[PDB]
Design a binder for these strands. Sequence first.
DNA 1: GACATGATGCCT
DNA 2: GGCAATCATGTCA
Length: 282
Amino acid sequence: MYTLNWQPPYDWSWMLGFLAARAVSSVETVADSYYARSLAVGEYRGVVTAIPDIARHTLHINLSAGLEPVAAECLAKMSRLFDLQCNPQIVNGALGRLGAARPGLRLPGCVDAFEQGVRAILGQLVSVAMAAKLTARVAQLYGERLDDFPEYICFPTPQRLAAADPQALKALGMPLKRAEALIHLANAALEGTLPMTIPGDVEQAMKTLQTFPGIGRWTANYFALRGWQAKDVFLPDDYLIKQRFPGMTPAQIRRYAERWKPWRSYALLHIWYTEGWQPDEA
DNA sequence: GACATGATGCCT
DNA sequence: GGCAATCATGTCA
Ligand code: NA
C-alpha cells in the first residue's frame, strides 16, 4: 500500500542475502523478491512485507490490519532497515576502488534498537549460523505469536527479557555472562538508558554503552552501526577484519581506517565482502 | 575423555 | 598477553 523511493544503484540481492543469513525462524521470512517479518509498534502488532521494485526504484510496503494505525512509524522502520536515505554517488565518490565492485551496497539497519542489541550480544564469538540459532531459541522461548498470523512470532520484548532467569537463557547454549548481558540490556531499554536512535555524540554514546556488563568495544561499535545506522564506525576487533588486516593490530587497523572518514561504516561493509582484500602496502 | 582450535569480554 | 567462554570438529592415547 505504501511506496518509498531509493536512489539507484541498490543491490537488493546482497541486502536480502545479508538479511537471509541472519534471519530468525518464525520472526522474519526472506525471499529473493521480498522481505517480511512480524512487527510491534507499541501495543500494535502485525506483519510487514517489503517488496522492492528495481524498475521504478520503489519499495512497496504492505501492512497487516493491526499495524495500520501506526503506518508511518512502520515505514520509518523499513527505511532505516533498508537504508533508503543513502546517496551512492557520494559514498562511492569517497571510497574509490574499495566500492567499485559493489556500488549498490547499503548499510543493513534494524527495525528496533533493543532487538539489534540482543542480536549484537548473541553475535559475539560464534559464527553467523550459531548466533542465528541462539537468537531463534531466545525468540521461541520469550516471544509472543501473532494472533492473526500464527506462523509468525514477535521478537522478545524488553520487559520479558528483563524478567528472564539467567540460567534459563544459559541453558539455551550461551555463556552466563552473555545471558546476564541481555537481561541488563533489557533493563536499560525499560528505563530508557539504551539510546533507541543515533545520538549527537556517537563516540561518547558508545563509550557509555561500553560500561554495561557483557558489552565491549566490538559490540558497542557493531550496535552503533546496525542499531543507530551510524555511518562512521569501524570494527577493528572483528574476527574477519583481523583476517583482512594480516598481521596488523587493532590499533593499527584503526589509524588505517581513518582514511575512510566519514564513511568508515560503509568501508567495513565493502571490506567484509571483498574475499581477497588486503591493505595497500604503505 | 583429555586437549586444542574455529568462530568477544575483561583484567594485569 | 592471558583467562573465561559455548557448541562443533578434529587429533590422539
Ligand atoms: Na563493559
